[model samples]
Each structure stands twice: as structure tokens, then as C-alpha cells.
Target: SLKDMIDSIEQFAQTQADFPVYDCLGERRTYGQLKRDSDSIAAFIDSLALLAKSPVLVFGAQTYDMLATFVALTKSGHAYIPVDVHSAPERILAIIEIAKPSLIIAIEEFPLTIEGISLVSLSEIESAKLAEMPYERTHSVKGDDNYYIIFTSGQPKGVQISHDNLLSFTNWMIEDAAFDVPKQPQMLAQPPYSFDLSVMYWAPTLALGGTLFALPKELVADFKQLFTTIAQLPVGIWTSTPSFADMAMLSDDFCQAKMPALTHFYFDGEELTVSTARKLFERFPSAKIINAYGPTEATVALSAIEITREMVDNYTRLPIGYPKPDSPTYIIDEDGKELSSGEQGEIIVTGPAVSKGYLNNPEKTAEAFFTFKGQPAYHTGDIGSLTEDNILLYGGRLDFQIKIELEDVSQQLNQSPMVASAVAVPRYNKEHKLLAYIVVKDGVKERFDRELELTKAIKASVKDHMMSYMMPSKFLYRDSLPLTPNGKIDIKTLINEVN
Candidate 1:
């Protein structure tokens, strides 16, 4: 039912010209303004005698002008690379080195400058006037041409998403019964434009002629300002990381009373924990929560399941969902043989939405992407499996096979009443060795003055639950474990310290 993404958005501007399309803080823009602004910006871009079909970099955060700039770049037959202004200069430089863009559209004052490429200020483009005022899209980006290049968060390797690839994603969002997207939905736009997760809100919302109520990074960081803004907006659909949702739940005001019209919640970019789902159900009893999973290489997401109260109660870890109808996910072992249902292995996705590969990085492209049964396939490296009903389950990363033995040992250790927290790290020197780092509960130290006494108690408590092979050879006591920026225990650091 959907064809060209650009044409579809442009059609809306033609038919529903005055309807609201984007809103940020107090500023709002209509479809009519979206067209006029995009066209004007596109006309100015056309005047530049740059290489046709080459990429252009747009640097900004969540702003109405940023949205218009995305549309404008496509209108001008160039793919746009979005670099969030908060990015380190190294990241921006890496993107430029990889993309080699013809122009850089500075939506904010670009902190650094490239010696060769031209940098066009957003204000200059906004005030642009030319004889060819309304731009024409005779040779706009279409079909196999890349629609946009999204660089991976670290190392900044560009993943080229084509027009067809984008269609595969947005069309599913519009048509999926699971999503149950509202007509002209008022969507929460929280993620930066540079992140693929932002596509979850912007694409479907724009395609259906909906309004994006943006929460800039600064606003999202401040709880008082964040809640005040949320109270005013009529947000029908909420899309964000589960972490962001958890942060929102910090305030008791984030409930049905605060946002009566909020009916749908979409979470991706991280695992949706059962505790988080339970808290949301308690707060917003009527809203539908859908947990989706995918890597950026697969164009935002590949699987999604609506989390019901039953699911929250029944499952310790939630299932990501059935694979999309056209794009199926297969679990394969180390030898590349596909595993049967209920078998845990690496996830491989084959679909139209799969990227051609990393832009200008053929070595990495070949490593991660390949032809599987003649269809384009990507090696996700994420560990998972499919149930009998084809529901996908996520295990941690492929490298951490701790789920088999190490995690079990760690869990049993934590189950001991004397232990507050426990982590098992595997190290290989001559033979396999498992080192257990244990933090004893308060008042545990008072019972035993000797370290040997507490260790003996922990071993005695968990001896039955843990197998002989699963027991840690060495036990180390710690007051507290170091955490990474994402709040995960610094396992890599622990591994380094052990060796």
C-alpha cells in the first residue's frame, strides 16, 4: 500500500497542508510550512554544483528544522547523514572521513570545521531566496540509492539504509496489527535524530500525518521540566528506550492522570525487564506496551510483541516477538548450521530491510553480511532462540556464554542469605578457572572476623544448588563492584583484574 517514502510525505503536504506535523517545546509547524521550508532549503541545495547523489551531513538535535532538513536533503537527490550536535568532535570527523559528504548543514553552530567541505548555516538556508523558489525532485533519492546513512554509535561506521529499506520498516509500522497505531498519533519524539530508534516514532508518525512532540536532550535530563512538558502534550504513542521509561517512572506524576490520552508504549534499544513492565502496568493500566528488538543493520527493528499483564506475570524475561512476516530470524550454531526451535544460538536475519552493508567498509561488510539461501542476511551476533510458536527469546551476547555455567553459579551464590551480590568471571590460563566476586550482606562481617569464616558459610549455603564443576575455584570479597556507564557491572574490568 506504500510506495516512495518521500512521495508519501510530500503527498500529505499537498492534501493536508495546514495540519500540524511537528511540535517542540512551544514551537509548532504545519504540513504547509514543512513543504515550503523543505522546498526552499532543497532549492538552495540544488544551486550548489556538488556531486549528484553524494551524501550531505545534517548536524543537530531534536528540532523541527532538523526534520525539515532531512526532507530537504532527500528532495535535493542527496542522502543525509545526521550527526547529533552533542557528539564528540572525533565522531563527527569520523563520519566526514567515511561519508566524504559534499556539504554539511549546520542546524546548530558546528563546533568544528572541515578544511575542504562547505558548511551551510541553518539560518542562511531558512532565509534562502532563489529564482527557483520551489524545488523540483526530478531525480530525488529513490530505489537502490541510499535514503540516509546512520553511523554506528562507536567507531562511527556508516550503515546505509536505502529507500526500499526504509519502506520495509515504516510500512510494517503502519500496517502491523500488533502496533495498533492510532490515526494521526501524537508521538513522543525523545531520541536524537542520529539514533536509529528515533525512526520508530518519526517514520510512522510522519507517514500517517501525525505530530511529533519532541523532548530535547536538555529537557529530558531535567525531571521537573520533563514532567511539566509531558502534562501539556496529548501524546497518544510513547516511543523510547526501556531505560528512559524507567527514568520517567521515578516521578509518581507519570501516570494515567498525568497523560490520559497516552495509549501505546514502544520500547527498543535495550531489553524490557519484567519489573519495568510491571511498574508501567501499575501506572498506566489501559495502555498497550510493545517490546521490539533489532540491530540498526535491520532498519530499527525486526520483532515486536505487545506485553500483556499475563506476559509480565508469566515470563521472567520477555520474548521480543515473532519475526516480521517477510523477514524471518534464524538461530545458527558456531558451524553455521541452523538450530531447531528452542535451541539457543546466534541470530541471523534475512530480509529486504537488511542493509546492503556498512558504507565504504567492505571488509566489515563481508564479515557481518552474507547471502543465505540466496537472500540478503546479516549475522546479528546477538544470542537468541525461537520457541515453538516462533516467539524470539534473547540471551545475552554471543561472547558471554555464561548462561550455561557461570551465570548459574553466580545466581546460586547470590541466593545465599549471607551474600548481597555475586559475580562469576571466567578466566583461562592452563585450565578453566571461575573466579567469584562476592559482596556480603550487612552484619555478615560481624559474625566472622576471619575472611575464611564468611567464605565457608557462602560455600556451605550454595553447595547443594551449584554443581561441582560450577563452583568457583577462587572466592574474592568486595565492598562494591565497579559499574560501566550503562550501569552494567564492569565485567571486562573484572576480567582484566583477575588476569
Candidate 2:
């Protein structure tokens, strides 16, 4: 119930003020220290951010100040737009222009100056050391007011998460809805702060007065540093994408000895494989693995299931379990009628966990959100069903009808000077994935390690042009195309080769 109210955070400041906020970074903060720093930043914001109707931008890596800045902005009645330090300058600048923020809070120095925006840095705030401040007519965004605005990808529509929405999620998580984590957990925080996945654990962890081992992108990539950090940090609750676990398993050191205190594991954002469950359970026999499922549109997550070694060994597939207490999920047929038990249908969520809509993009909002029986309903693109016993089961996906956009990806690929022409065809291996048949311009084709270098370049170009569903699984190189009787590239012949 720790919603807005600066008094509540101040209460924590009075009670467990010295609790370590960030165990890593060697830059730690106690609850008292965070409150003091954020109060100072809030005071600075109070003086300058009069045009605070728009979301304020916070650009930084995952650090103590960044987390404090977030709480500060929220307490000051402003929604924060977090753009991680890893984002390209162009991407950051574009968000600033689109958001029309009253102020831009950068973690470090900016390369250039914007003509009409106020840019402040972390150093400036800590040095200024202002006092606790006041907000406009009201103190902060209460209940339904937006708290954080997160963008999905490059040039994306923003997803507005209100104070009520976030609290609903964090409340369920902390109150034994997901994992019965310890009171003061030493949590491992990976994923960029800009990502919604990070919020799943980070928000609840902070409120529960836990210590965070912040793992930035650079640290996650370095195997030596990552293992070293993992071993040293007293992480008890492990939360990350399934890919992260797979990456960690690549090194055999990911065992009980490395983190003996680890008793809870939480995963979202991707599918959980049977192999991953088996390997991790073997390593940490006492640890429990929880697979929480939900899209970003529904805050962090709504449904969860604690996976067991018994289920893994006995069943080939696993269920996602029932929805959290206040979150209601229904499986409706394509015709908008509710499906019966055991019948697969698209997931429709209508509850506190659901978001208001895409920020500033009403048309896109209408496409996904609508009212159903007087409740705010969001049509999730996932396939789901309810068991006869009232448990929930997850079907892989509704359908990936998003494939034909590959031609758009092909067009973008061809635009590069290095590529003469490119074509993507619907091809399938056992995984039923697509492949791109590519032809590069002659000069680059003859260079040393031409295939490897050109392949990476073309894939990178494809990534920039299209989403994951549009990207190809593999790239096949050809010097020339098969010609038809009319001298045009033979489509049937290319299809035949792949098939």
C-alpha cells in the first residue's frame, strides 16, 4: 500500500534509513542517503520544472543516483522517461523532442547543447544540495496519475504506467503472490533501467528495503567481470530473462557455491525452456524457479507459476499458473466471446495491472485497449487458456502473421551501398523460421572473409529496419540469381532451392 505519499518513503527513511540500497558500484546508498539526495534533486526540480505536464527525461546507467532520481521525480508529481546510457545519441535526442520534457537530467556531460531545453547533471544536483521541496497545487501524482513512461523500441509509442498501476503490481509481488523472498533480499538487478523487465524486481526490492547488485550492459557482457561480481555479491533473489540464465550456464561456475543464499529465481520477458530449469535446479537444489508471464502493457507481470523439478521431469510442457489476486485474465475467442475451459484463445486482461493506454498515441491506444463490461480491457497478443481446475495454461502465441513485412526489411537492406540487392523468402527448418537469400555488390563479395563481414553488416542493417519477427534466421549468399525464361530472377527457382 506504499503508493505515492512522500511521508511513506520518509517513514522508511526514519525506520531503516541505513539499509544498503545498492550493494554493487562501490557507490552505495542507505535509505536515509537516498531520501536526502532525492529530496535535494526534488528541490532543484521544484524551482525549475514549471512546465512539468510533460514527462521529464532521465538518462543514465543503473546507479544509486538514477534510482533516487526516479523516486524523486515521482514524489514531485512528474513521470520520468528513463533512456539508458547505452542508447544512441540520435535515439535520446528524438525522445527528448517527442516528449517535450521541461528538463533533461543527464548522468554525465552532454556532447552538445539543445537550444530550448534545460539540461542538468547528477553532479550539479549533489553539489547544489538543495532542501526538501514542494510541488504545484498538489504534492504528487496520486493513485491513477502516471508514474513512468516506457518506450518499447526505436521510435516507439510510450507506455504510461500510473502510480496505481505500478503499486498494484509491486504489491502482489511483495505479498507472496510471486515469490516468498526474504524481507531484506540482496537482489541481482540486470537489464537496463529503461526496460520494463527491470522494474518487475527492482521496484518491489526497493520497497521491501532490499539491497541491489546493479549489473549494467557492459558488466553483463564481460564474462570475467560478470562471474566475479556474481560470486562476490550476496544475491538471494535471481531475476532476469531466460537468455541471461543460459548465458550464465555457459560457465560451469554458476553453481550453489557461487551464490549459496540464492533461494528464489524469477523470470519474465521470454519463454522458459525445460533444459534451463533442469540445469539450474541441479546447481541450486534449494532454489525455487518462478516463471512470471505478462506483456509490458500489463505493467511488469500479472500471472506466475513456480516451476518444480517434479513437473520438469514428469511433464514436457509447463503452465504459467493463475493470475495475481487483483489481476483478471480471460481467454476469448476471435469473435470476442469467452472461451470454455481448456479452449485456446487470445488473452484479454481487464484489471488494475492493465495500463491506461499508449501515451500521446490515441490511435495506437484504441487498437489494443477497449472497455469490456465496464472494465479497462487490453487484448493481449498471447494465446492462453484456463484449466478446468482454475489454474492457467499458456499457449505459445496467437499467431505470427507478422512475417510478410520481410519485403520491407529487404528493401531497407538493399538501400545500403554495400548491398546490390536482397530478397527474403518464407523458409522453414525444424524451428519453422525464415531465412534471407542475399546478394551483395561484387566488390565487397571478393574481399577477405567477405561472407562473414558482409553477413554481419547485412544483419545489422536488417535489425535497424525491422522488428524481431521481421528479421531472418539465417543469411544465404549467392553470387548470381537463377533467371527465368523471360530473363527475370526466377522466384520459383529460389523458392525451390530453400525448400
Candidate 3:
């Protein structure tokens, strides 16, 4: 197993070890040094009188301390729940209540307000104390063990994932993708730890003995610094959402930066437009840009498609290519029968990567994970069809899932009692906001003047689909809506203006 492989490295650390692991801030620690630090921290955590598999909430930016905390918790047979420090306080508190973590490991400055939970300051763990501790042989963790409980963004319904899910996903990645040595790849860790996307950022780096550089948050604010960082690192691979790439392309530094060493640029978590791919190729002409597709339930990613200049020029929406090794994908109709080629249906995936269902939520587990032809498969809730060539063509979501400002909104108040119907009209304007044209029930006198009022009300009630930023910048009212031959609303015919 992967855990066993990691353990073997620990055992090697005690005798013949000489491998360097460096954090983004240039703090270097050898494998032997890391083992000692992990052992001491694991012993400290064990001394806290916490139960086995007790949840530990880790909050802060990606740092060596956070990585060490993860190693320590996993060593102590505890699962770590990562919450981004930038996450809303109320949302973080709610997750704390749900997971009931025994301790919260945080930076000294970003202390959580959860009462009765012990908070460990990472800065307080002295180097001398870590070096003095004796290394205990790492324990054998099985595939079924609870590894980490990752909370889905509260934007949709919050969900938790286990270790089994991650192991399966990474195993498939190892088989399909090239994490081989001599690539000595340095992956840019861009995603916030709270989002499941961070797994792609950190896991591959640690698992493959590659360097993981946490792209500075300030760099995201200033693309010039980001381009400089990319140019400096011996980086071969870049993984992030397409929006990030779009942001990079807008910078003059990106156009001029020498990225001769970069070979692969991967994107997931949102739609990858051909225009963005072209922009990336224009800069890093030799790089292979890949588009990956999957949800948190099946770990970071399941399928991948590498973009070429020709493919980008011919296609608008890049196809989410064939499934990674050991992962099987099926497109099933509403009746649960497998659909033929070109027939749109919900995409279901069955494999080791499929999680052990949502944490502590049996009903959701049952609904999402069911015996499909005697094997457990996750219903992706996405509408797509398998092409004759076996590639998956994405056709949006079966539900009201929409991406607003790169955040996933599973369902919004479009189906609420107050609203007769709601349709999100994509504004082609520069901002690209989704304007929601809503049909409110008669006799309800709530008039929307400023966009904030409607957004606040929707956020308060639905609490799922539309977030504060997703609330339509403009609202349009209608008494009745026109329909198509299929009885669906002619959403495309809706005017951009009231004229």
C-alpha cells in the first residue's frame, strides 16, 4: 500500500537517509530530520489523551509546520481536517461542531475560537525537542483506515472524505500520469487547503519525492511576482483551475517569462476553455496542458485530456479524456440503464477512488454510493455523454450546479417556493456575471433594487447554490416565460436588456 511505501521511507530515514524536503519559505529538513520531528509531534499528540482516529482540525497557510502536523496526526492514527484560515469564521465553527476535532493545530496568530478544543501553536515546537526524540517505527495503515476528513465548501452541502478515497485516487494517478523520477518535478501548490483540490497540489509532491512550492498568496494578487517565481523554480508541472491560467495570461510578465523547463500544465475544478489553452500554449509553447475532471467524492481527479494547439483551435470545450487506470466510468440514463454513445446521461464512476461515502451521513452515502451492477459507484450528478472514441463530453450538470467566481454552487434558490422559476443568463460582458432572471410568485411585494438584497435573502434561505458573490448583479422580472418545442424555457432568447 502507499502508506507502507511511506513507512519504508521512514525506516530508511533511521539508517541510510539523505533526502532533502524544503518548504516554500526555503526552510530545509532532511528525511531523518522529518522523521524525528514527526515522531516527537506524534508522541505529543498521543500524550494529549485523545481517542484513536480522533479528528484534528488544521488551519493556516501551507507551511512546513502544517505538513509536519499532517505527518504527526497520520502517524498517531488520527485524521486531519484542513480548514483554510481564509474561510468564514461561522463556517469554520460549524465544521468544528460537526467533526468535533480533539485539537486544532494552527499558527500562533490564526487561533480558532472553538471552545473546549485544545489549540497547538506550531511555532512553539522547538527544533531541539524535535531532534532529541527517538524515532519509532511507523505503524502499518491499511487501505480502509480513515486518512483525512476533507470538508466540501459550505457553498454546496458540506461533505467529508476518508483515506480510502484518496489512496485509490492517487494510485490511479500514479499509474496513468508520469510521476517518475528524473522529472524531479516541482508542483506549484496553489489551491487553499480547505478545498479538496489541494490534494493534487501536495499529495503528488510528497508521494513522488518531488518539491511542492506553495505559491505565495500575494503572488496571486500580483502576477509579476508569480511569473518571477515560475521562472526561478526548476518547475516542470503547473496545476490549477483555468481561471488562474486566465489571470496569468493577462499579465505582461507571463508573456515574457522564460518557462523553457515547464512541460505539463494541468487544470481541473472548473471548465477549461480553448481560448485559455491557446493563451498558455502561446507562452509555454512546448508545455503539454492537460484538463482533468472529477469531484471531491472521487478524490482530486479521475479523467484527463492533454490539449494540443490543433485540438484547441478546433474545439471550444476541451473533452475530459478517458478515465485513469483502474477507474471505470459509465454514463447512465434516468432509468439507470447505461446509455449508448452520444446519449447524454449522468456520469457514474466505480473504482477504488470512490470514497467510503460522506462522513456520518448514511442517507447521503446511500444516495450517492449504491450498488451499481454489484459494485459501488459514485453518481457524479453531471450530465455528459461518452463519445464513439470513448472520450467524455461534458454537458453541464444535471442539477443547478454553477460556477460563480470559481466557487461551485450545487443548487440555488431557483427552485424555491417564492420563485416560480429562475434562469441564469450568462452575461457576455467583461465581468462575466450570471444574471438570474427570476419569476416571483404573484402578491409577493419584495422588489429587488440593489443586487445585495436579493443575494442576502437567497443566501439566508437556500444556503446551497448561489453564494454572496454569485447573486446576480442584475435581476429581471417576468409574469410568464416562453417555452420551446421540448417544453423547456427558451433561455437563449431572453434579452440582455429590458428594451
Candidate 4:
């Protein structure tokens, strides 16, 4: 099956060799060069003694070499994990530690702290003597092998995804989603490789034989350069998170500049507001705006709703459309019972697109990925309700997880077995702040406070175990948390107190 896809890419490459494939900085690589570079990198990967499906970590910013390396690893039946060079050192180290990759491939002059790991530079591949290689494919990797490990910022945990997961997602996005525009659509690649939004940029372009202009890192940082690039490209499709798109619209050049030949604007990775939809429509009146919703566990996206002017005006919140054909989405009550249409419940997804599970954490995998109604389903931990139209209206996270804009912050205090309950409440004095609400044994608050003088002291205990972002902003005293009839903590009411 993958052979057919590879053959299609090769044919496209042959036909569109002179056509622009990627525009990075001032440099451009055609489809033919992309194919050749991928083949060369595949040959280099084949030279390595590692087993098939061995994890290869690609650490770099957006560049032609990074793109080639990704294609080569996938084509060679090996999994590729993209690590952002700009990421914090600790976050980068955590991924390397968990992935335990066999090798690290870096772009030219890529600076990173990759200790005791086998490393190779892209320049080395370019300068090395070429070996006589067959034009035909030469890898024996199955579709089920791990394809990519896209990190999601939540509770300091990373999700390891497989080829089957991505392929399933790609098929659904192409077949079911309305973003399937014809005639070699041009896509603006804005999201970092580590984010799931990257799937929106690559999958559609690759699958539909479209052109993906890799936005330069500096352009992404400077709003002016970004809009300038967008204006220059004959791009028709734009995919990014709502926050990033909003930032672009807020730029001074957004309304005045000669808009690119844009046709569709797809936003995902976070909730889309009606106000944002209005602003997007005002900026690009010709573009068809879409709101997509899904978790990292479910490949890039599972459902999407096109935002029309009428829909945006009538509804305060955008609905996350119905599920795709290959993927099935369900809203279940706390008891795991499926809810009827228009009934609010937790969102659970089950399909080939669902990931294998978290990397190296069996307990978490067991909790998140489980059999729902005898079929494998991942508990998304998001609150949503099914509409009469079969659309899903996402509320928010069902757990203590708070998504402040694009960042997914876990509100849980600790994973220690001794703690009975942990909750996170937002404290708003002027701006929103997080407060840790813990329910431990009676009379332990004094002991816990004595052991730790300030909130910083308490944070020191769990700093090593979790990311600094996961640390609570403030610690609050609570004798006991209010409980619902189901014996679960009544977080809504508890949070109401702080507000």
C-alpha cells in the first residue's frame, strides 16, 4: 500500500521537478530534488547497522535537510522523531531519554546538547562520496511501525505515534475533510515540527500533491516577514493553530497587504472562538475558514467544521464537526456509558488514527487507552456534547488540565501514591493564575507546610519529576474537597470558590 503512495510521489516528483516544492529563506527545492535527497538519505540510513523501525531523532529548525531527513526515515521504514532545536534543554533531554533513539541527525550548524548519542550532520551526507544506489524502493517497513513521536505539552508526558496512526489520519483528512482543494494547492507551513499542527501542513500537501512552502524561522518570529512571505506565495491553503493565525491577523500588514491567493484557512490544535472567526473572515474574506478539533492521541485531527459568516454570527462557540468515516468519536458519561445526542459527556475517540499510547509509561497508557464497549478507544479527557446534527461541541478538558491558549498545562499536584486527591483551581486577581488544591490526610497540612516554607519549596520536591511549567503557581489549604454523587471531587464547585 505504501509502495503505491511512494510511486505516486515519485511520479509527481518527475512531473513537477521544476515546480517549487519548498521555499526556505531564498532557497527552493523542487520535487525532483526532494525525491533525490530522500533517496540519498535513505541510502545513508541503510548504511547504518540499526534494525528496521529503529528510532531516528531529527533535531533542527525548518530546513530542506530536515524535510529530506523526515522523508528518508519514513521511506526507509524507520520512525523519525523531530525535536525542535529551540526547545528548552530539559524538554529536549526528556524526549531523547524517553525515545531512546538509535541516532540523531542534525542540520548544518545545528547546536544542541545530545550527549552520548550517535550524531550525524546533513552536510556530511551532502559531502560524502555518493554510493551507487538503485532508483527503486529498498525498505521492508510495515505500516504499523512507529512513524513519528509528536510531543504534546501536558503533565510532562509525550505521546509516541505509529505509521498506522498517521496513515489512517492522512486518509481520513483527504477523503472526508472539506479542505481537500484540487490543483496543487500551496500550504503555508507555520507550526513547529514537534506540534501536531505540523500534520496539517505536511499530510495534505504530500497526499494531494500540493506545494508546501517552509516558512523561515525568522519570518515566523517577525510578523512582518511572515505576512510578506504569505503575500509573495501563490498559496491557496493555510493551516495553523488559532492563536498563531490570530497573531498574523493582528499584524499591521494583514489588512493592508495584497492578500495571497488563499482559498482555505484551516485552524486546529486549540479551540476556535467566534470572535476569532469574525476577525479571520474580515482579514481574508475570500478564504474558507475551518475549525478542526482533536487530541494528539488521535493523530493530528479527527473532526472539523467550516466556519461560515452565518454560523459564526449565530453561535458563540464553534462546533467541532462530526467524525470522519474511518474514525468514530463518542461522548460518554462518567460511568463510561455512551450518551445520547445533545447530552454532555467526556469525549472518547476510537479508530486506527488513535495512537498506540504514551511512550515507556504503562500505567498512563492503561489509563488513557482502554477498551470502550469492547473496542479500543482513547479517553480524550475533553468535555463535549453531540449535537442533533451529529456534530461535537467541545467544551474543554474534563480533568484538571488547563489549556491556556496553546499551552497544555497539567493542574495535578503530584503522582505520588500517598496523595489521595489533587486539583487545580484558577485564581484570578487581575490575570488568571493557577492554585494547587490538595486533599491529603487530616492534620497533614501543618506538617506539609512545615517541611516546605514557601510555595517554591514545595515546588522543589516535584521539580525533578515534572517540568517547571507543571509546577503550581500557588498552594492552597483544603481540609477536604467537595464530592459529587459519584464520589468524584466536584471540581466545578471547587473552582467556583476561587473565581
Q: Return the top candidate by TM-score.
A: 1
Q: For each candidate in the order shown, give its overall lDDT on alpha carbons.
A: 0.83, 0.74, 0.66, 0.70
Per residue, candidate 2 scores C-alpha lDDT tens digits across 241-322 of 7757766775666889877878888988765656668878888998899988887888988888889888777653566776
TM-score result, candidate 1? 0.86
User: Which candidate number maximizes lDDT?
Assistant: 1
Candidate 2: segments with Cα more than 4 A from true spot: 1-7, 109-113, 130-138, 399-499
Q: Candidate 3: worst 10 consecutive residues by lDDT?
A: 404-413
So what's the TM-score on candidate 4?
Answer: 0.78
| Pairwise TM-score winner, candidates 3 and 4 | 4
User: What lDDT does candidate 4 reach at residue 462?
Assistant: 50
- State the lDDT of candidate 1 residue by residue for 33-57, as single tens digits: 8888888888888888779999999
Q: Compared with the true structure, what per-residue lDDT tens digits does model 4 show for residues 277-384?
A: 777878877778888888899888889877889987676467888787778889998888999998877899998888888877789899999987676799998888
Q: Estimate each model's TM-score.
A: 0.86, 0.78, 0.76, 0.78
Which lDDT value does model 2 have at 425?
Answer: 67
* Better candidate by lDDT, 2 or 3: 2
Q: Where does candidate 3 stray beyond 4 Å? A: 1-5, 8-17, 126-131, 137-140, 154-160, 177-183, 217-224, 255-257, 401-499
Better of 2 and 3 by TM-score: 2
